[PDB]
Curated annotation (Swiss-Prot), chain A:
The lineage of its organism: Viruses, Varidnaviria, Bamfordvirae, Preplasmiviricota, Tectiliviricetes. It is found in: Virion; Host nucleus. Induction: Expressed in the late phase of the viral replicative cycle. It comes from the Viruses. Homotrimer. Interacts with the capsid vertex protein; this interaction binds the peripentonal hexons to the neighboring penton base. Interacts with the hexon-linking protein; this interaction tethers the hexons surrounding the penton to those situated in the central plate of the facet. Interacts with the hexon-interlacing protein; this interaction lashes the hexons together. Interacts with host dyneins DYNC1LI1 and DYNC1I2; this interaction might be involved in intracellular microtubule-dependent transport of incoming viral capsid. This is Hexon protein. It comes from Human adenovirus C serotype 5. The chain holds residues 452 to 502 of 952 of the full protein. Major capsid protein that self-associates to form 240 hexon trimers, each in the shape of a hexagon, building most of the pseudo T=25 capsid. Assembled into trimeric units with the help of the chaperone shutoff protein. Transported by pre-protein VI to the nucleus where it associates with other structural proteins to form an empty capsid. Might be involved, through its interaction with host dyneins, in the intracellular microtubule-dependent transport of incoming viral capsid to the nucleus.
From Swiss-Prot, chain B:
It comes from Human adenovirus C serotype 5 (HAdV-5). Induction: Expressed in the intermediate phase of the viral replicative cycle. It comes from the Viruses. This is Hexon-interlacing protein. It is found in: Virion; Host nucleus. Three N-terminal domains of hexon-interlacing protein form triskelions between hexon capsomers. Residues 30-57 form a coiled coil. Belongs to the adenoviridae hexon-interlacing protein family. The chain holds residues 71 to 137 of 140 of the full protein. One of its GO terms (biological process) is symbiont entry into host cell. Homotrimer. Interacts with hexon protein; this interaction tethers the hexons together. Self-interacts with adjacent proteins. Interacts with kinesin light chain KLC1; this interaction leads to capsid disruption at the nuclear pore complex during virus entry into host cell.
Length: 51, 67
């Protein structure tokens, strides 16, 4: 028998959805100067490639 | 206005900073030396051309007064 309330976890939903939408559809399109280069991963030296 | 935060993963990557420093040094060398050498070569060419013309005139003047 459980004594007291049941174990549970919390998460804000609307905030998460809005954050996903905003991050994708804006952040992934900022000018490259604000973007950086990752770490320990090879990346094309040509800036115009998809990579 | 002021706009720069791009140094984020530059701080996160010492090798990137070292490569940027080497690139800056190479750019300094290339730009400064090439500009100086080009200006000097231009000046030397102009002076040499004028000097040759003056030498020709002096030779003519020497030839035109046969003491």
């Amino acid at each position: 028998i459980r004594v007291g309330n049941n174990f549970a976890m919390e998460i804000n939903l609307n905030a998460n959805l809005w954050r996903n939408f905003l991050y994708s559809n804006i952040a992934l399109y900022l000018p490259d100067k604000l973007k950086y280069s990752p770490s320990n991963v090879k990346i094309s030296d040509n800036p115009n490639t998809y990579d | 206005t002021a706009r720069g935060i791009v140094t984020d993963f530059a701080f996160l990557s010492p090798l990137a900073s070292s490569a940027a420093s080497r690139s800056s040094a190479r750019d300094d060398k290339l730009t400064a030396l090439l500009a100086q050498l080009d200006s000097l070569t231009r000046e030397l060419n102009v002076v040499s051309q004028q000097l040759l013309d003056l030498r020709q005139q002096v030779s003519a003047l020497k030839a035109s007064s046969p003491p």
